[PDB]
Design a protein around this motif. Structure first.
Motif, PDB file in Angstrom:
ATOM      1  N   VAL A 204       0.850  -1.194   0.000  1.00 13.75           N
ATOM      2  CA  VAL A 204       0.000   0.000   0.000  1.00 13.75           C
ATOM      3  C   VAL A 204       0.880   1.236   0.000  1.00 13.75           C
ATOM      4  O   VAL A 204       1.913   1.268   0.666  1.00 13.75           O
ATOM      5  N   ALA A 205       0.482   2.248  -0.760  1.00 17.19           N
ATOM      6  CA  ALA A 205       1.166   3.540  -0.715  1.00 17.19           C
ATOM      7  C   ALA A 205       0.938   4.132   0.668  1.00 17.19           C
ATOM      8  O   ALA A 205      -0.204   4.326   1.082  1.00 17.19           O
ATOM      9  N   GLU A 206       2.027   4.368   1.389  1.00 20.58           N
ATOM     10  CA  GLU A 206       1.992   5.018   2.703  1.00 20.58           C
ATOM     11  C   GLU A 206       3.007   6.137   2.659  1.00 20.58           C
ATOM     12  O   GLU A 206       4.139   5.935   2.196  1.00 20.58           O
ATOM     13  N   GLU A 207       2.622   7.316   3.132  1.00 21.30           N
ATOM     14  CA  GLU A 207       3.561   8.431   3.201  1.00 21.30           C
ATOM     15  C   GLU A 207       4.610   8.092   4.274  1.00 21.30           C
ATOM     16  O   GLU A 207       4.284   7.599   5.355  1.00 21.30           O
ATOM     17  N   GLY A 208       5.873   8.306   3.938  1.00 22.11           N
ATOM     18  CA  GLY A 208       6.968   7.973   4.837  1.00 22.11           C
ATOM     19  C   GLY A 208       7.633   6.646   4.521  1.00 22.11           C
ATOM     20  O   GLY A 208       8.783   6.445   4.865  1.00 22.11           O
ATOM     21  N   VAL A 209       6.899   5.738   3.874  1.00 26.75           N
ATOM     22  CA  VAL A 209       7.424   4.435   3.513  1.00 26.75           C
ATOM     23  C   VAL A 209       8.062   4.519   2.140  1.00 26.75           C
ATOM     24  O   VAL A 209       7.442   5.014   1.187  1.00 26.75           O
ATOM     25  N   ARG A 210       9.301   4.040   2.055  1.00 27.53           N
ATOM     26  CA  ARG A 210      10.067   4.118   0.834  1.00 27.53           C
ATOM     27  C   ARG A 210      10.721   2.797   0.421  1.00 27.53           C
ATOM     28  O   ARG A 210      11.106   2.646  -0.728  1.00 27.53           O
ATOM     29  N   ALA A 211      10.803   1.833   1.337  1.00 28.57           N
ATOM     30  CA  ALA A 211      11.426   0.559   1.047  1.00 28.57           C
ATOM     31  C   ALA A 211      10.675  -0.619   1.676  1.00 28.57           C
ATOM     32  O   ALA A 211       9.908  -0.455   2.618  1.00 28.57           O
ATOM     33  N   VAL A 212      10.876  -1.800   1.101  1.00 22.99           N
ATOM     34  CA  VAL A 212      10.570  -3.051   1.785  1.00 22.99           C
ATOM     35  C   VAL A 212      11.835  -3.891   1.771  1.00 22.99           C
ATOM     36  O   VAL A 212      12.645  -3.810   0.846  1.00 22.99           O
ATOM     37  N   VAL A 213      12.009  -4.667   2.828  1.00 23.08           N
ATOM     38  CA  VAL A 213      13.133  -5.576   2.974  1.00 23.08           C
ATOM     39  C   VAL A 213      12.564  -6.976   2.824  1.00 23.08           C
ATOM     40  O   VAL A 213      11.654  -7.341   3.555  1.00 23.08           O
ATOM     41  N   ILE A 214      13.051  -7.729   1.842  1.00 25.64           N
ATOM     42  CA  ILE A 214      12.545  -9.067   1.550  1.00 25.64           C
ATOM     43  C   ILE A 214      13.610 -10.129   1.884  1.00 25.64           C
ATOM     44  O   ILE A 214      14.596 -10.195   1.184  1.00 25.64           O
ATOM     45  N   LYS A 215      13.426 -10.896   2.974  1.00 28.25           N
ATOM     46  CA  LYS A 215      14.292 -12.038   3.359  1.00 28.25           C
ATOM     47  C   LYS A 215      13.794 -13.389   2.803  1.00 28.25           C
ATOM     48  O   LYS A 215      12.945 -14.027   3.414  1.00 28.25           O
TER      49      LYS A 215
END
Length: 300
Positions: A204-215
Protein backbone atom coordinates in the motif's frame (compact mmCIF):
# COMPACT_ATOMS: atom_id res chain seq x y z
CA UNK A 1 15.94 -38.97 -15.68
CA UNK A 2 15.76 -37.39 -12.22
CA UNK A 3 17.99 -37.73 -9.22
CA UNK A 4 18.62 -35.73 -6.09
CA UNK A 5 21.00 -35.30 -3.15
CA UNK A 6 20.52 -33.68 0.25
CA UNK A 7 23.32 -32.56 2.55
CA UNK A 8 23.20 -31.65 6.20
CA UNK A 9 25.72 -29.28 7.75
CA UNK A 10 26.69 -26.98 10.53
CA UNK A 11 29.14 -24.12 9.98
CA UNK A 12 30.90 -22.59 13.05
CA UNK A 13 30.15 -18.93 13.70
CA UNK A 14 32.66 -16.25 14.72
CA UNK A 15 25.73 -17.26 24.19
CA UNK A 16 23.37 -17.02 21.19
CA UNK A 17 24.58 -18.48 17.85
CA UNK A 18 27.70 -20.67 17.76
CA UNK A 19 26.82 -22.73 14.67
CA UNK A 20 24.66 -22.18 11.65
CA UNK A 21 22.89 -25.42 10.81
CA UNK A 22 21.22 -26.08 7.50
CA UNK A 23 20.78 -28.11 4.36
CA UNK A 24 21.43 -28.12 0.57
CA UNK A 25 19.35 -29.76 -2.14
CA UNK A 26 20.97 -30.80 -5.40
CA UNK A 27 18.45 -31.58 -8.08
CA UNK A 28 19.67 -33.32 -11.20
CA UNK A 29 17.69 -33.79 -14.40
CA UNK A 30 19.48 -35.23 -17.40
CA UNK A 31 22.87 -33.45 -17.44
CA UNK A 32 21.57 -30.26 -15.83
CA UNK A 33 22.03 -29.58 -12.12
CA UNK A 34 20.41 -27.27 -9.57
CA UNK A 35 21.36 -26.32 -6.01
CA UNK A 36 19.43 -24.63 -3.24
CA UNK A 37 19.91 -23.90 0.45
CA UNK A 38 17.32 -24.69 3.17
CA UNK A 39 18.49 -22.99 6.41
CA UNK A 40 15.72 -21.79 8.71
CA UNK A 41 16.84 -19.17 11.18
CA UNK A 42 16.35 -19.82 14.91
CA UNK A 43 14.20 -17.05 16.47
CA UNK A 44 12.99 -15.93 13.04
CA UNK A 45 11.81 -18.95 11.06
CA UNK A 46 8.60 -20.63 12.21
CA UNK A 47 9.75 -24.14 11.14
CA UNK A 48 12.79 -25.88 12.68
CA UNK A 49 15.93 -27.32 11.06
CA UNK A 50 14.67 -30.88 11.54
CA UNK A 51 11.16 -30.05 10.35
CA UNK A 52 12.87 -28.45 7.33
CA UNK A 53 14.76 -31.68 6.66
CA UNK A 54 11.61 -33.83 6.85
CA UNK A 55 9.65 -31.64 4.47
CA UNK A 56 12.65 -31.24 2.14
CA UNK A 57 13.29 -35.01 1.88
CA UNK A 58 9.57 -35.65 1.36
CA UNK A 59 9.23 -32.93 -1.27
CA UNK A 60 12.24 -34.32 -3.16
CA UNK A 61 10.69 -37.79 -3.34
CA UNK A 62 7.57 -36.08 -4.78
CA UNK A 63 9.80 -34.23 -7.26
CA UNK A 64 11.30 -37.54 -8.51
CA UNK A 65 7.74 -38.79 -9.17
CA UNK A 66 7.09 -35.75 -11.39
CA UNK A 67 4.61 -33.80 -9.24
CA UNK A 68 5.40 -30.17 -8.77
CA UNK A 69 3.63 -28.52 -5.89
CA UNK A 70 6.19 -26.64 -3.86
CA UNK A 71 5.97 -26.63 -0.11
CA UNK A 72 4.65 -23.44 1.41
CA UNK A 73 7.20 -23.75 4.23
CA UNK A 74 9.42 -20.68 3.61
CA UNK A 75 12.91 -22.08 3.91
CA UNK A 76 12.13 -25.15 1.81
CA UNK A 77 10.09 -23.31 -0.82
CA UNK A 78 13.01 -20.97 -1.14
CA UNK A 79 15.91 -23.40 -1.58
CA UNK A 80 13.90 -25.91 -3.56
CA UNK A 81 12.94 -23.06 -5.96
CA UNK A 82 16.57 -21.92 -6.37
CA UNK A 83 17.53 -25.45 -7.34
CA UNK A 84 14.59 -25.55 -9.76
CA UNK A 85 15.64 -22.22 -11.34
CA UNK A 86 19.26 -23.38 -11.76
CA UNK A 87 18.03 -26.58 -13.44
CA UNK A 88 16.38 -24.44 -16.15
CA UNK A 89 19.28 -21.99 -16.42
CA UNK A 90 16.89 -19.08 -15.55
CA UNK A 91 18.68 -17.57 -12.53
CA UNK A 92 21.43 -15.67 -14.38
CA UNK A 93 25.01 -16.05 -13.22
CA UNK A 94 25.39 -12.25 -12.89
CA UNK A 95 25.38 -11.11 -9.27
CA UNK A 96 25.57 -8.01 -7.04
CA UNK A 97 28.49 -8.44 -4.67
CA UNK A 98 28.57 -4.74 -3.66
CA UNK A 99 28.30 -4.30 0.09
CA UNK A 100 26.41 -2.01 2.40
CA UNK A 101 28.83 -2.81 5.23
CA UNK A 102 27.49 -3.42 8.71
CA UNK A 103 28.75 -2.76 11.99
CA UNK A 104 28.92 -0.14 14.59
CA UNK A 105 33.46 3.29 -5.22
CA UNK A 106 29.95 4.41 -6.22
CA UNK A 107 27.03 5.50 -4.08
CA UNK A 108 28.35 5.19 -0.52
CA UNK A 109 25.93 3.05 1.49
CA UNK A 110 26.32 1.49 4.93
CA UNK A 111 24.14 -0.49 7.34
CA UNK A 112 23.57 0.00 11.06
CA UNK A 113 21.70 -2.31 13.40
CA UNK A 114 19.69 -0.12 15.81
CA UNK A 115 17.26 -0.72 18.68
CA UNK A 116 19.47 -3.19 20.55
CA UNK A 117 19.84 -1.03 23.59
CA UNK A 118 19.38 2.67 24.25
CA UNK A 119 17.79 4.65 21.43
CA UNK A 120 20.30 7.35 22.33
CA UNK A 121 23.33 5.22 21.41
CA UNK A 122 21.96 4.42 17.99
CA UNK A 123 21.02 7.98 16.93
CA UNK A 124 24.37 9.24 18.15
CA UNK A 125 26.32 6.69 16.10
CA UNK A 126 24.00 7.40 13.15
CA UNK A 127 24.58 11.14 13.33
CA UNK A 128 28.34 10.68 13.75
CA UNK A 129 28.58 8.54 10.60
CA UNK A 130 26.49 10.83 8.41
CA UNK A 131 28.39 13.89 9.65
CA UNK A 132 31.81 12.33 8.83
CA UNK A 133 30.81 11.12 5.34
CA UNK A 134 28.74 13.89 3.62
CA UNK A 135 27.66 11.58 0.79
CA UNK A 136 27.06 8.44 2.86
CA UNK A 137 23.58 6.99 2.83
CA UNK A 138 22.49 4.72 5.70
CA UNK A 139 20.19 1.70 6.07
CA UNK A 140 18.95 1.19 9.60
CA UNK A 141 17.48 -1.99 11.06
CA UNK A 142 15.22 -1.63 14.15
CA UNK A 143 13.34 -4.95 14.07
CA UNK A 144 10.43 -3.27 15.93
CA UNK A 145 12.58 -2.20 18.87
CA UNK A 146 10.89 1.02 20.01
CA UNK A 147 7.95 2.53 21.85
CA UNK A 148 6.97 5.90 20.36
CA UNK A 149 9.12 7.61 23.06
CA UNK A 150 12.28 5.72 22.17
CA UNK A 151 11.48 6.32 18.52
CA UNK A 152 11.65 10.03 19.43
CA UNK A 153 14.68 9.70 21.75
CA UNK A 154 16.75 8.15 18.92
CA UNK A 155 15.93 10.80 16.32
CA UNK A 156 16.69 13.43 18.98
CA UNK A 157 20.36 12.83 18.06
CA UNK A 158 20.14 12.93 14.27
CA UNK A 159 20.64 16.27 12.47
CA UNK A 160 17.42 16.92 10.48
CA UNK A 161 19.60 18.11 7.60
CA UNK A 162 21.25 14.67 7.25
CA UNK A 163 18.02 12.73 7.67
CA UNK A 164 17.39 12.55 3.90
CA UNK A 165 20.52 10.39 3.69
CA UNK A 166 18.87 7.68 5.80
CA UNK A 167 17.54 5.67 2.84
CA UNK A 168 15.36 3.72 5.26
CA UNK A 169 14.81 2.81 8.90
CA UNK A 170 13.18 -0.64 8.97
CA UNK A 171 10.43 -1.40 11.47
CA UNK A 172 11.24 1.27 14.06
CA UNK A 173 8.22 0.61 16.27
CA UNK A 174 6.14 -2.21 17.71
CA UNK A 175 3.08 -1.37 15.67
CA UNK A 176 2.87 -0.19 12.11
CA UNK A 177 0.66 2.76 13.11
CA UNK A 178 3.51 3.97 15.38
CA UNK A 179 6.18 3.46 12.74
CA UNK A 180 4.15 5.49 10.30
CA UNK A 181 3.73 8.17 12.98
CA UNK A 182 7.49 8.19 13.62
CA UNK A 183 8.07 8.60 9.84
CA UNK A 184 5.78 11.68 9.79
CA UNK A 185 7.10 13.38 12.94
CA UNK A 186 10.76 12.84 12.16
CA UNK A 187 10.77 13.06 8.35
CA UNK A 188 12.82 9.82 8.37
CA UNK A 189 11.96 7.24 5.66
CA UNK A 190 10.88 3.80 6.83
CA UNK A 191 10.91 0.25 5.53
CA UNK A 192 8.78 -2.78 6.32
CA UNK A 193 10.59 -6.05 7.10
CA UNK A 194 8.89 -8.40 9.57
CA UNK A 195 5.51 -6.90 8.52
CA UNK A 196 5.88 -8.52 5.08
CA UNK A 197 6.04 -12.01 6.66
CA UNK A 198 2.96 -11.60 8.87
CA UNK A 199 -0.42 -12.71 7.53
CA UNK A 200 -2.47 -10.30 5.40
CA UNK A 201 0.25 -7.77 4.55
CA UNK A 202 -0.77 -5.46 1.72
CA UNK A 203 1.52 -3.44 -0.50
CA UNK A 204 0.00 0.00 0.00
CA UNK A 205 1.17 3.54 -0.71
CA UNK A 206 1.99 5.02 2.70
CA UNK A 207 3.56 8.43 3.20
CA UNK A 208 6.97 7.97 4.84
CA UNK A 209 7.42 4.43 3.51
CA UNK A 210 10.07 4.12 0.83
CA UNK A 211 11.43 0.56 1.05
CA UNK A 212 10.57 -3.05 1.79
CA UNK A 213 13.13 -5.58 2.97
CA UNK A 214 12.54 -9.07 1.55
CA UNK A 215 14.29 -12.04 3.36
CA UNK A 216 13.72 -15.01 0.96
CA UNK A 217 14.58 -17.86 3.40
CA UNK A 218 11.83 -16.53 5.68
CA UNK A 219 9.47 -15.69 2.81
CA UNK A 220 9.48 -18.72 0.55
CA UNK A 221 9.79 -19.34 -3.13
CA UNK A 222 11.84 -17.24 -5.50
CA UNK A 223 8.53 -16.84 -7.37
CA UNK A 224 6.95 -15.23 -4.31
CA UNK A 225 9.97 -13.04 -3.66
CA UNK A 226 9.76 -11.77 -7.20
CA UNK A 227 6.04 -11.07 -6.68
CA UNK A 228 6.82 -8.93 -3.65
CA UNK A 229 9.57 -7.09 -5.54
CA UNK A 230 7.14 -6.31 -8.40
CA UNK A 231 4.48 -5.07 -5.92
CA UNK A 232 7.00 -2.73 -4.32
CA UNK A 233 8.35 -1.41 -7.66
CA UNK A 234 4.76 -0.64 -8.76
CA UNK A 235 4.44 1.52 -5.58
CA UNK A 236 7.81 3.25 -6.12
CA UNK A 237 9.52 1.45 -3.27
CA UNK A 238 12.97 0.00 -2.94
CA UNK A 239 13.08 -3.77 -2.61
CA UNK A 240 16.18 -4.96 -0.77
CA UNK A 241 16.92 -8.69 -1.02
CA UNK A 242 18.43 -9.68 2.40
CA UNK A 243 20.35 -12.36 4.22
CA UNK A 244 18.80 -14.67 6.75
CA UNK A 245 22.46 -15.67 7.59
CA UNK A 246 22.72 -18.27 4.80
CA UNK A 247 25.98 -20.04 4.00
CA UNK A 248 28.08 -18.74 1.13
CA UNK A 249 26.03 -20.88 -1.31
CA UNK A 250 22.70 -19.19 -0.47
CA UNK A 251 24.36 -15.78 -0.14
CA UNK A 252 25.71 -16.06 -3.79
CA UNK A 253 22.20 -16.98 -5.07
CA UNK A 254 20.76 -14.03 -3.07
CA UNK A 255 23.39 -11.89 -4.79
CA UNK A 256 22.17 -13.36 -8.08
CA UNK A 257 18.46 -12.89 -7.31
CA UNK A 258 19.35 -9.25 -6.49
CA UNK A 259 21.05 -8.46 -9.80
CA UNK A 260 18.12 -10.15 -11.56
CA UNK A 261 15.16 -8.69 -9.62
CA UNK A 262 16.51 -5.52 -7.92
CA UNK A 263 19.37 -4.66 -10.34
CA UNK A 264 20.16 -1.19 -8.99
CA UNK A 265 19.66 -2.09 -5.30
CA UNK A 266 22.60 -3.30 -3.23
CA UNK A 267 21.38 -6.47 -1.47
CA UNK A 268 21.77 -6.86 2.33
CA UNK A 269 24.13 -9.80 2.19
CA UNK A 270 27.13 -8.76 4.34
CA UNK A 271 26.70 -11.63 6.79
CA UNK A 272 29.42 -14.06 5.58
CA UNK A 273 32.12 -12.70 7.96
CA UNK A 274 29.91 -13.84 10.86
CA UNK A 275 30.86 -17.41 9.87
CA UNK A 276 34.14 -19.36 9.95
CA UNK A 277 33.95 -21.08 6.54
CA UNK A 278 32.36 -21.06 3.09
CA UNK A 279 30.87 -24.17 1.43
CA UNK A 280 30.40 -25.37 -2.15
CA UNK A 281 30.31 -21.88 -3.62
CA UNK A 282 32.72 -18.99 -3.19
CA UNK A 283 31.86 -15.41 -2.39
CA UNK A 284 34.32 -13.28 -4.39
CA UNK A 285 37.06 -11.74 -2.23
CA UNK A 286 36.39 -13.71 0.95
CA UNK A 287 39.55 -15.46 2.17
CA UNK A 288 37.49 -17.79 4.43
CA UNK A 289 38.28 -21.44 3.65
CA UNK A 290 35.93 -23.46 1.43
CA UNK A 291 34.29 -26.73 2.44
CA UNK A 292 33.93 -29.02 -0.58
CA UNK A 293 30.81 -31.14 -1.27
CA UNK A 294 33.19 -34.09 -0.83
CA UNK A 295 33.17 -33.27 2.92
CA UNK A 296 29.44 -32.65 3.44
CA UNK A 297 27.21 -35.08 5.33
CA UNK A 298 24.90 -36.65 2.79
CA UNK A 299 21.35 -37.65 3.80
CA UNK A 300 20.23 -38.55 0.26
Amino acid sequence: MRSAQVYRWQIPMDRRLKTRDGLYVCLREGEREGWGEISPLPGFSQETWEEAQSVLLAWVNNWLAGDCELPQMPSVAFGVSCALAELTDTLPQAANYRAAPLCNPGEKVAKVKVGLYEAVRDGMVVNLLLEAIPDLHLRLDANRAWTPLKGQQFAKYVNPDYRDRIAFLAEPCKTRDDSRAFARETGIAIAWDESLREPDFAFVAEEGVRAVVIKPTLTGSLEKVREQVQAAHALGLTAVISSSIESSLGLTQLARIAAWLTPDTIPGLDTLDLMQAQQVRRWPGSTLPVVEVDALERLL
